Each structure stands twice: as structure tokens, then as C-alpha cells.
Amino acid sequence: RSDGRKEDQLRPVSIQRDFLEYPEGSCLISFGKTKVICTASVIENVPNWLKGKGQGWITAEYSMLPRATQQRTIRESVQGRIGGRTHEIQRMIGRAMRTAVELTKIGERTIWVDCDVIQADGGTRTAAITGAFVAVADAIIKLHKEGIIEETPIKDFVAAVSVGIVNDRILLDLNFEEDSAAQVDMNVVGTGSGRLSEVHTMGEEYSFTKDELIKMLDLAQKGINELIELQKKLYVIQDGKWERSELKEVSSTT
Amino acid sequence: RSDGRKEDQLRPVSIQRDFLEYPEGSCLISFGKTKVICTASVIENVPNWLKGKGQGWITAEYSMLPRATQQRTIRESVQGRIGGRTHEIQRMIGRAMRTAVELTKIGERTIWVDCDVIQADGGTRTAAITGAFVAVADAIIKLHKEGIIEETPIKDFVAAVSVGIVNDRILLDLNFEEDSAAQVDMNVVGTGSGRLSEVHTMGEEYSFTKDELIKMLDLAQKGINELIELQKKLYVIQDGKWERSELKEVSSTT
Amino acid sequence: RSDGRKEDQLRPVSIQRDFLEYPEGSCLISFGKTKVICTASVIENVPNWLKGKGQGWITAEYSMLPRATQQRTIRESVQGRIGGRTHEIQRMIGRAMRTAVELTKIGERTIWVDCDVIQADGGTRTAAITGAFVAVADAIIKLHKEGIIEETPIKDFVAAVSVGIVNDRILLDLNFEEDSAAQVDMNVVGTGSGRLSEVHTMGEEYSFTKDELIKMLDLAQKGINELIELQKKLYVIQDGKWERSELKEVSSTT
Amino acid sequence: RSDGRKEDQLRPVSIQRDFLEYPEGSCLISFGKTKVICTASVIENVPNWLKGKGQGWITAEYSMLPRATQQRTIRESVQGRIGGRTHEIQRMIGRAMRTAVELTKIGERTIWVDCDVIQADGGTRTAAITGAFVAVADAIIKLHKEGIIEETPIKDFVAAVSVGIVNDRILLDLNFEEDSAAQVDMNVVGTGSGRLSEVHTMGEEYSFTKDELIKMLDLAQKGINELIELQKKLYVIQDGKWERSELKEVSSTT
Amino acid sequence: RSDGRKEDQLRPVSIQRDFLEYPEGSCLISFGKTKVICTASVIENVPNWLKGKGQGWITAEYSMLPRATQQRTIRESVQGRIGGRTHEIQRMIGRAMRTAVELTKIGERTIWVDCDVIQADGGTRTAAITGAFVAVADAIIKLHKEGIIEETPIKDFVAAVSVGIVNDRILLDLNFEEDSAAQVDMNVVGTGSGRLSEVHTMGEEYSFTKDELIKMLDLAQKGINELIELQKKLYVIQDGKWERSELKEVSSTT
Amino acid sequence: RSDGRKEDQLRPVSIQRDFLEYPEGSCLISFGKTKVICTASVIENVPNWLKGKGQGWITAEYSMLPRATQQRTIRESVQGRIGGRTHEIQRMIGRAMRTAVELTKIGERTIWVDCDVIQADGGTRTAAITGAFVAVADAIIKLHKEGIIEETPIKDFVAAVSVGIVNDRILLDLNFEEDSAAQVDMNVVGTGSGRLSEVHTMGEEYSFTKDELIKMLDLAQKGINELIELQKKLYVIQDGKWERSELKEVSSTT
């Protein structure tokens, strides 16, 4: 590989919690040059279609600072048109966070997740999912510690990774060059207990076989395991009770 | 199932070509109550980033008439905000059509695919992919017959189907009620030669196992086979040469 | 005329009711190559300025699929700017439907009319008015049959036709070439009892005389009569009681 | 009538030319409380579809200051959505100006007409057409005087008036109360030589007869004559040569 | 100076009240060729964040007719994007009006200020502030005279002027050419009692000294005094009681 | 003061350069809880109105992540309307950067400055100006080091600070509570050589005196001096030649 990384090998991962002071939960996560600030903020209200239904909600906002992929990514603000890509990813991130939380026990409140890509080199949405989880878990633990809620209703860890087929090679965690050069690429969202939350595989003018898909899904699930092993070092859990470990930062030894 | 259909059974499928006179290719396809007008029109130009590169292009526009799911689906016109869902599906449809055509041999022109959902009851995007293929193939055959291009550069058939897990049952081709009630659901885009172009599986606050995913991918590939067997009755192909059969309409015998 | 049609002669008209299953009323109407899907759906509510005023409402949405006039008509969605033309026609269609119904007796509900032009070759808005009436009448008859309302409060038939002056010839029902080549053209919306609901005459850089206008208004009213004679074959009316005839389709014998 | 005006009687009309210094042509016209600033500015260019075609163009922009009809008319700016009504009227005004000018002889330039309603009490679009003509004529006369063009290619005067049926009375030049209370109302755009440029008649949930339409078209044409007699006092024309009279202001004696 | 005006000399100022009939207050103010219609209209309501708080509000809308600076200033309507400049000025004008009124005593109602630039040649926002005050004062005096409110809660006069450094000369009240050619320019909003409400000084790629700023602020305050002396001729005030003088128009003698 | 800070005392300032790898220049600057990522990226092109004019350009984009002031600041993306506040600040930041650079010597290229507020507690735009300068200087030094340009055409340091009058106290560098509670507040943009680039003072329904303004401008200029003394520790300059010092981070000793 370009950067001398093995095919079934992730880039250097780094997750730093308590990145910012104001949000209930926050972290700066990085997969190589890809960097994402993930924050979780509690809004003491709920969408209207949920009112009175004894449940909370989680929603996500994603944004890519104009300086991404060492190119230009002008925001959906001072430009006009609003990309349907940003929404696709926001919906993804929201779906991952919601799958991981028992919203029943969160109360009639909303956790507003914000993923700000401050540097892009491929895999920015999976890095955002992986980091967003940390921020959401921390925010729920914070809410508990503040007595706003009884327990810490977090179902399981959640992480994501990309995998692709490049020049007929199956690669894990693609940077931006490998991804643009890919025949087939995909995104997997998995849980701590080894299950899956989402898998999107797309042929880029090339088609693939069911078996190629399984090979990829297998390498991805291994990537999710490594990412979740990192995430696990930040918590001390017992019988569904979540507390933060004393680590403020975890990183892959590579 | 609600409608008395088996679990591994599709709804009544119907594809009618030559639905309209003006487009090079067009059809009305239906999966049960879900109905979609698919048209393919040739625009004698190409996007700017493609100019001079000796290649053609295919792009898709999708729209859902205000009367969908027996509810309201006001267009992205007299409303303002533009859904990122419509774009997700348009990109999908475009990716499927492009995978199926050798754009190199189409010339510096663009095939504009339009999918108009005139009635929605689940699986509207897969019905659109299945129908869009027919319209695109017909348009390429038309272009050939008009002498605009030498051959009929169509690589293979392309169809799509949805599958899901509902009350722990794995169901094929979900209508709107089964889909809203689903724990896990997915969309598969496959080719005539049995390969895959795209697969998107999403847990709806439930997670699934790799094996459950394979079971689903297996039922889906069988659905794609049936859909492609229908599509095949509309063409007579030999050594990469495509002509239309004399059928103007094909339907599953159910 | 280009198509060998007399000057005071309409193109082949065709109206097919029950085109779709979900809407209370629906039809596919065609004036030559111009084709429009017209549906009428009941929304169990009313605009706010009408609440509590013991009255119902009718509103229309019009849209022209990207493949119109064998050219490009990209929707007011994935483009941005919203044409003031679409609104002009929607307001027109709404005004025609409302003139024909005694909204007092419809209840505090709204009939949402949707006109989807699936093929355009001139006269698409008059075809939409003519077809929209059928869909609205059917929807009111349906509402009655479902016991939602007591009577079938339809005041009279409503249809529309275009007429123009081309190379100093006064022509009825203009296709797209005759219209672009016209010095003066107009749209008339008339009722079954021979009255008028709307008439818009526009000089296209040419001016006309009051007498030329009367000649045109006269030919148009004859076109409305023929269109209404077709529409009449679809209903059996007596003392303000409306039922559908057994025809599912009516067409001009030409 | 509310204001003691006869039925076939206009409100006090006033046209003041040279209202502003910067535009080639400009005036403040008033029909009762309805007041409109009309300016005509020359832009030394043409729309792209006209380039090289040896012709000029005229286009109009209409706007209604937030304080109209003694109510609120917030602009299509700090609100978002853009009304399809403003466009309907802009297209109307542009069509009237273009019908009156021989664009062939104007050169490859554009006359930008701006109608700013500074006070609204009915008939604001007809007042704008009547006033816009004065501004356009003046601008063409100015262009001639500056030697930019050879002749003053103005075909004829152009004015507009509204008429309606209120409580079964046919009234000329409706203010805002008469218009809201009208069963039928219309707008006529006529020329100096007694011809017509545009006529739009709309039943407001009431239908009318061809003869009622003629009665209205007759009263309107008389209103156009009076308005054009005022406009004529501002020019001295001979053999298609236009010069301004010494009047800076003209008003109906009432 | 270009127009033969001294450096510490304003252009000819003119303020005409009762410009229009419908608004509670209105005037046409002019600074040289720069002309602005300023109207004040009472809306019998308040923004939601103010409800029940026993206070009124003042908000402003600013717009520049397409014919400004003898160039093109197409509105924020039939263009799309909405300038952040118009908002900057609207907020400014609103802040000036609010500083001058004791909103506590105005009641739970809103004064809607509209500034319509009908001709631009520099200093259009300061002319708008100066004129808007007159319209607001008149509207409050009107409200009092109609018995809607007890007193006339106007704190003090408010006016504005621009000043700049051009070719190292400090000039008062810049027209459009002096402003575009300026190294430093600013806007001051002052009160009758000689105080300040707002001051914005901007280096245009040139920086300035604190002392240069004071020199400018000094010339500006003198310009505000002259403008307020004009404004004062339109009112007769005593012990916080405001009545209009018999002047309908005031102008600088120059 | 709330946080025990003196009145003429800044919050703890921190500037970290080389914050990110991809941009030519970048830093994370902080004024208390207010934190802003400032990046400078070179775009090898120029706006059209500048082409061929032998000059470069600098433009800025500002954005406030949804989690600001421990509240909600949803971007100008998935919301619709685009704030005129963001533009006011972007224009400000661009004006400050341009005043500090000799664009003549930068070449026909553009420096794209991006200020991303990742945490807001008052003074976010002044923190952005102060930090943006560092990123721009670094980017120019980088461009020089890469041989793209001959010299390092930076005219002088540029920094900004806010000051206000709160409960009649004149305070330097206001946090969010002091600012909302302020009678008068302002923003000053000054240079290393002690000059000024911009000063905006606004009465918040209170007016102030010229002398109060001078007192404030005096405290602000002292704040700019301290901020510039920090900035200076990051560079080693001689005869207009700029190199970076070995500091990667500088902070006020407080």
C-alpha cells in the first residue's frame, strides 16, 4: 500500500475524550490524516412526533470544513444548494447512535450529535460514527452523574470501518486515493457483541460476487473489533452500568 | 403475509415497454401497488468534467408524486427544502445504469433517466431500478437503430429487490407496511450473470448477524433472478447484439 | 395543419378513469401526444385560514416530467429556483376545480389534485384541467359512496382548450409547434352549461382586435362542448346526484 | 360606489415623468391610492439566447413594498419562498413593453423596466403597465437623443385597466375592496390604435357568459382610451418620430 | 470635490413627510442623488419572544431597487441568494430606531419600518436612518393622536452620516465615487443630545490612526447636528410631548 | 468580574500553529472557553473580476458548530435560510487579512481562510481574526518555502479584541454573559504598528459619548498589543522577511 500499510491493517487510530468543555460528551478521533470532532449535546426537548411518548431521541449533524481531501469542501451555507450526501451520512450516524441506546430510558430529551470533519483523507463517515459513539456514551454517563437520569442506558459499543477492492486487492480502511481508485467499496457499522447495524456495498461501475462481499464483510468485522477494543479502554462497564475509565486518550499501538 | 403471499415470493410484476412515444425508451413497471414510469431520453451533450474524454454518461432523476403510500408526498418544488433521500436514490439508479453500459461506446452524449413514482406501496426504488434498465436498454437499441451509434453497448441485465426481517421472518419484496414494521431491511442491485452491483442493509434500531445478512442476500439474489427472467423476455440477444423481442408487455405468472 | 387536422378540429382525445388504485379519483387524459395523469386525493384537514368555517377546499399541484416537448423539463426540485409558471397553472387548475364544486357541502376536508404531465406537445394545462375534473368528480362520488358526505355537491362539468392565431389562421387546440409559431394564443376554461370560468388571451408581440378575440372565444367554446360531451359519457346524473357510468374509458371518435 | 365614483369611471389618474434622475426614463403613476414608481434603464447587453441576432430586449421586475393594501407585503427577499404571482405580473409587463417596441431597431441592448409599487389599493399591475410604457418610451427617446440609436422605434401607446363584476354590477378600475368582493374580474392590456395585447378574465368561483365578457371588454377598452389620451399629452409624435411634450406631469381632470 | 462641495459640507438634504397616505408615518428623504422612501407601519402584534412582556418592537426592511448607482441592483427576490449586506443594514436601522423609542410605552405592537432606496449615489444607509426616524416619529405621533397610546414615547432625534478619507483628505457625506475611492470610510449614528448610537469605521486595505478616527468622528458629529437641525424643524416638542410642526417639507439651505 | 478577571484584563489566550497537516497554515486559538480552528489554504486561482490583474486574493469562510454558547447553532446548511451575520463576519475577517498582505506579491492565487468556531463563549469573531492571521502568515511563509513565491509579502501583524460597557463598567474581552448584558459593546481590529483596521461600536438601546468611545478604543488597543505580543513570539522577522520561530504554541502567562 501507498503508506506501507498491510492490506488487513488500519491506519493509526486515536480517540481523545473531553476534547471540549461545553458539550456533555466530546472527542477528537483520527484515522490517519482523517480527523473528526464529535460532540454530543443534550437538548431538553424532543421532536413533535415523539412528544408524550415517553422516549428520547438522538439526531446527528455532519459537516465537512472547506479544507478536505487537501481540496475545497465549501459548507452547505454560503453556497446555496444542499447536498443529499451530507443527509445520507447524517441519517447513518443517527441510526448508529440510536441502535446503541435504549431511548426509552433517556427521558423526553434529545442528544444532538455533531460531527465536524476538520481534515479529510478517506473514511470520514466511519471515523465520525466511531467517534460519535464515544461522545454519546460520555454524554449519557454525564447525564447520569448529574442525576438527570437513573441508569446509563447504553446497549453496546458501536464502530465503523470502510473496506474496498482496489486493483483486485481487498483493502481495509481506505484513504482517499485508494477509495477513488476502487472498483468496489463499502461501509460497515458493527456492535461490540460482534453484530452488524449497517452495511452498504457499492460497485463503482464494476460488479462483485456474493463471496467477494463476504470476504470484505469479514475483514471489516475485524476492523470493527480493533476499533471497539480501543473504545473499550475508555470505559469500565459492569452489569449495564457505565463509567469512564481514567483514560483521556487511547490510540492504536499500530 | 398480509396479502397471502409466501415469504420468498414477489408481488405480481408487470413491465410494459413503449409506454410513451417521445422518449427513446420507456416503460411502466409495477410491483404490486407500487407503480413507476421509467423513461430514457438522449441529450446530445455531456457534463463538463467529461467533455473530450470520448465517453458518454447516464444520470437519473427520481420523483414521488404527492399521492404515495396513500398519503402525501409533495414534490421538492412548491415546498422549498430538497430531500437528501431523493438524491440518495437518484445516485443509486445512476450507478446501476452506468454499471450496465459500456459508456465508452455510447458516444459523447447523455442518457437522461427519469423515474416517476405514480403510486407507492413499498419497494419504489428497486422497482425504479428494474424498470429504468428496460428504458435504458431500449433507448440504446433505438439509438443503434437510428444509426447514431455502431453497436448496442449493453453489458448485462440489471434488476433490484428489497428484502427484510419482520417479526423475525425473512421476507422478500416488502410492501409499505412490512417495511415500516421491519427490524432489518435491505436493497440489492444485481446483474443477469448473477453478480451484485449494490447492497445496502440497515438495522432499524435492531442489529443483525453476518449469517442473517447472507440469508437475506440469498433470498434477494433469487428475487433478482426472477426479475431478470422477466426482463429477458423483452430482448433477443446474441454476441452482445441487442434487439427487442416482440413483447410489449411481460408479467410474472405469479 | 401539420398533422392533417382541420382548423376547428381537436386532436384525438382520450380519458381513462380509475387509472390508479390509491387515489379517490384518477385518470390518464390525452390530447394527441400531450398526456397527463390527474389524481384527486382526500386529505382529512383544511388550510388554517379556513378552519371552523364549515367549508372544504381544493388545491392543485402541477408538474412536468423532465421529458416534455421531446426536450428537458427538469423538476422544480434538484434544480433550485422555482418557476412562477408552475404556480400560475396550479392556481388556474385550483380555480377551475373550486368553481365546479359546492365546497360548503364537502365538509372540513381538502381534495388534493395532482396533475403530472408525462408527455408534452402543447396544451398541457388545458388537458390537465379537463382531466382533473374527472378525477375530482370521481373522488367526490367516491366520498359519497363511502358515506363520508351526504350528497355529491358537483355544480357542473368543467373543461379547457387552447386556441390561437397562426399565420393569420385561427386554430383550435394547438400542439407545441403551432403554439411557438403563434401570433396570438389563448386558454379558455368553460362549464357544461356553456358558461366561462376563465379566459386568458395573450398577444405574442402582435396585438389583436376585439372581433378576433370573439372569433377565438367562439371556436374555443365549441372545443369545450366536445370535451364536455366526452366527459359526460362517464357519468349518469340526475337532480344533482352523480354516479359513474360503466365506462372506464372514453375517446373522441375523431 | 364606495368612493362615489360612477361605474364606468376611473379613479384620479396622475403620471409624472422625470421622477428620478439616473434612469433613461422614469415616472410615478397613480390610480387613486395605488402608486407605482416605473423606471427604465439601459443595460448595454442582451440575454445569451439573443446574442448576435441583431435585436434588443425588454424585461421587467416588479415588487411590492411591505406596506401594500394598508397591510404587509414583505419582499421576496428576507422571507425565502419566491411568489409565482410576481413572476406572472413581470412576464405580463414585459410582454406589453415588447409588443410596443420594434426591438429590431433598438440594437443589441436591453431596457430593464422596474415597477416598484409604493402603495397598493387595487389595480397595481395595470397601473404598472400604464406607467412602465411612459418610462420605456422616454428611455427610447433618450437613447435617440444621445445618438445611441437612429430612430425612436416605438410602435404605439400601451395601457392597461381592470374591470369586474361586483354584486352583479360591471365596474371599471377596481380598488382593493371591490376586487376582493368580485365574482368576476379581469385585466386588459390595449394599444393606442384601439387593439388588444392581453386579456385575462377570471371567475372567482362564479362563471360568466360570453356576453358578460364582451360588456366588460367594452368598458375596459374605454378605460384604455382615457388612459392613452393622458399618455398622449406627454408626447409629440409625427411619422413614427417621438419627442416628449413639455409636460412633466399629466392628470385626469376627473 | 467633484461636485464643488467643501470637505466638511453635506450634499443638499431634503426631507418630505406625509409622502404616502397608508402608512402611519412616511417620508422621502434625499442626500444629493441618493433618494430613499421611508415608511413606518403599525402591526398590531409582536414577535413571539416578546409576547406578554409588556413591550413593543421596531424592525426594519431595507431594499435597493435594481436601478442603483446608475447600475443594476436586482432585488433579493427573482435572483435567489440573499445578501448578508441587506441584513447588516436592516439590523442597523432597527437598532437606531429602537434606541430612540421607549418601547415600554408603545404597547404590545410593532412598528414595521421600510426603507426603499429609489436612487443610489452613496450614503444610502445613513439617508435611510435619518429618514426612517422621521417616519417612526410621525407614526408614534399618529398612534397617539388616534388614542392607541397615551404619550408619544420618543427619547430623542436620531440621524446618520458617512465620512471618509479620500486621497488623504477627510470628507463628509461621501457620494458613490468618493466612497469607492476611499482608503478609510465610516458610518456614524448619533442622537439629538449629541451622543452616539453606532460607529463603524473600516479600513479598505489601509489602516488608520486613533487620531484620524477622532477627526472623522468629529466631522461626522457635525454632520449629524446639521441633519438633526433639519429634522427638528418638523416637530414641536415640549416636556417629552411630540407634535408635528406645520412643515411638510424641510431642506438644507446649503 | 464573574470569572475573577480584572476589567482591563484578557482571558487566558492560547495559539497553537500546525494544528492540522493539510492546510498551508493552521491554528487552534482560544480566548477562554471560546475556541476557533483557523486554516489557510491556497487555491491556485482567482475570482474572475481579478483575472489578469497581476494580484492575488484572500477570502474567508466562518462557521459556528451547532454547539455554541452551550446552546444550539445549527449551520447554514440543513436549515435553509442563510444568516446575514455570518457574512458580516466573513467580510470582516477577509478585510483584516487583506489589509495585512501585499496581494500584489502573492501571485494570481487565492488564500482561502476558514474559521471554524468549535466552542463559543463570546468574542468568537475577534478570536477568529487573531487566529486567522497566524494561519495566513504561516501559509505565506510556506508558499515561500515551497518556492511558489519570491518573498513573504506580509505587511504587519493583525489582531482583534472586543470591549464593552457593562453596568457602567468598561470591560475588555467580553465573554458571552457580559456581552448579552452590555449597554455598549465594540470590536476593534488593529495592527502591530499600533494602527487600526476596523472599529465597530454599537449601542444596545443605550447611547454613548465620544469620550466613552475613546476610553474603550484605548483599552482595546491595549488588548491588541498584548495579543500581538503573543503572535510575535511565533515569528522571527527581519527586513520584511518572515520565518516561523520554533514555537508551536504560545499562551498568555495571564
Curated annotation (Swiss-Prot), chains A, B, C, D, E, F:
GO biological process: rRNA catabolic process; rRNA processing; tRNA processing
PROSITE patterns, A to Z: RIBONUCLEASE_PH
EC assignment: 2.7.7.56
InterPro entries assigned to the protein according to its UniProt record, in alphabetical order: ExoRNase_PH_dom1 (IPR001247), ExoRNase_PH_dom2 (IPR015847), ExoRNase_PH_dom2_sf (IPR036345), PNPase/RNase_PH_dom_sf (IPR027408), Ribosomal_Su5_D2-typ_SF (IPR020568), RNase_PH (IPR050080), RNase_PH_bac-type (IPR002381), RNase_PH_CS (IPR018336)
Residues that coordinate or bind phosphate: R85, G123, T124, R125
Gene3D superfamilies according to UniProt: GHMP Kinase, N-terminal domain
Keywords associated with the record: Nucleotidyltransferase, RNA-binding, rRNA processing, Transferase, tRNA processing, tRNA-binding
Pfam families the UniProt entry points to: RNase_PH (PF01138), RNase_PH_C (PF03725)
Catalytic activity: tRNA(n+1) + phosphate = tRNA(n) + a ribonucleoside 5'-diphosphate
Enzyme class: transferase
Molecular function via GO: 3'-5'-RNA exonuclease activity; RNA binding; tRNA binding; tRNA nucleotidyltransferase activity
Function: Phosphorolytic 3'-5' exoribonuclease that plays an important role in tRNA 3'-end maturation. Removes nucleotide residues following the 3'-CCA terminus of tRNAs; can also add nucleotides to the ends of RNA molecules by using nucleoside diphosphates as substrates, but this may not be physiologically important. Probably plays a role in initiation of 16S rRNA degradation (leading to ribosome degradation) during starvation.
Subunit details: Homohexameric ring arranged as a trimer of dimers.
PANTHER family: EXOSOME COMPLEX COMPONENT, EXOSOME COMPLEX COMPONENT RRP41
HAMAP family found in the cross-reference section: RNase_PH
Entry similarity comment: Belongs to the RNase PH family.
Protein name: Ribonuclease PH
